[PDB]
Write a protein that binds this DNA or RNA. Sequence first.
DNA 1: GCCTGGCGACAGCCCACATGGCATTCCACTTATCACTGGCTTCGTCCGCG
Length: 244
Amino acid sequence: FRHAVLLHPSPDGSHVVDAWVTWAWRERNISPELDPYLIYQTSKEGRVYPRPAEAERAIWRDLDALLHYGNYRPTILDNCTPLAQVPQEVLDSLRLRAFGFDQDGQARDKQWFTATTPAVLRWLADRETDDNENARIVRRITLARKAAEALGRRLEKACKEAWKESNSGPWVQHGMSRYWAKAEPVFWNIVYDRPAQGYTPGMAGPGNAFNLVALAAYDEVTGPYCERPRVAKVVERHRSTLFS
DNA sequence: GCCTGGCGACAGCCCACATGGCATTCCACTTATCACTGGCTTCGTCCGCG
């Protein structure tokens, strides 16, 4: 470990009284091979780093554990969860859990959250017990998740690009907060097939349901600043990208 | 006491429009400007003040 701890005991051993947190190494070493658990990302210059936790995705409880219904995927999951592996039925009832600690890479810290996948999503598939309405449920759910995330990144980059341009960002924080808060019930309406705006029950896919929520959150955030024509032109150039 | 009815006489009828018209040119700007600050850690050293 990069950190070295020593805990001074209480005489009974019931508690710790003092603690020493200090370095064990002066020279850092590259740890060989990427960590299976984390989700990685490559960025211009080609450097590979783990995707940071975001407390905005924790606003919608348990969104990361929906990772199973899926581009880039953690290797441990991609070895043990799929069908090349070896178990027979086990894979049907496995369910994913994630521990995320969103914080600064320095000493500031913001939020942590656990996230087990809901057992309702797979159990709603077995209530029926048919090959087709079930594969269609699973297809819908996987489809819903894909739409919500693609427009989550589209909306992050939208707000981020617009904020930088408008001043020649704080818009991203409220953008994502509003996004997942509004995008959470529309997802659960798409799964149950209940009627959600931007969606028609029984449609083959998400149906633009998600693209509408992103536009409403974005327009909710950039709303007071689309007044001046110069800034309004920038904001419009970047909301247009969320039109899909 | 409450409810209802009454208080000269006070006019009637007929009549009501057709037709026509309703504009057109031109002209619509430039320039300059567009903030800062911070909300990490512990410790050590230096400088200032008493």
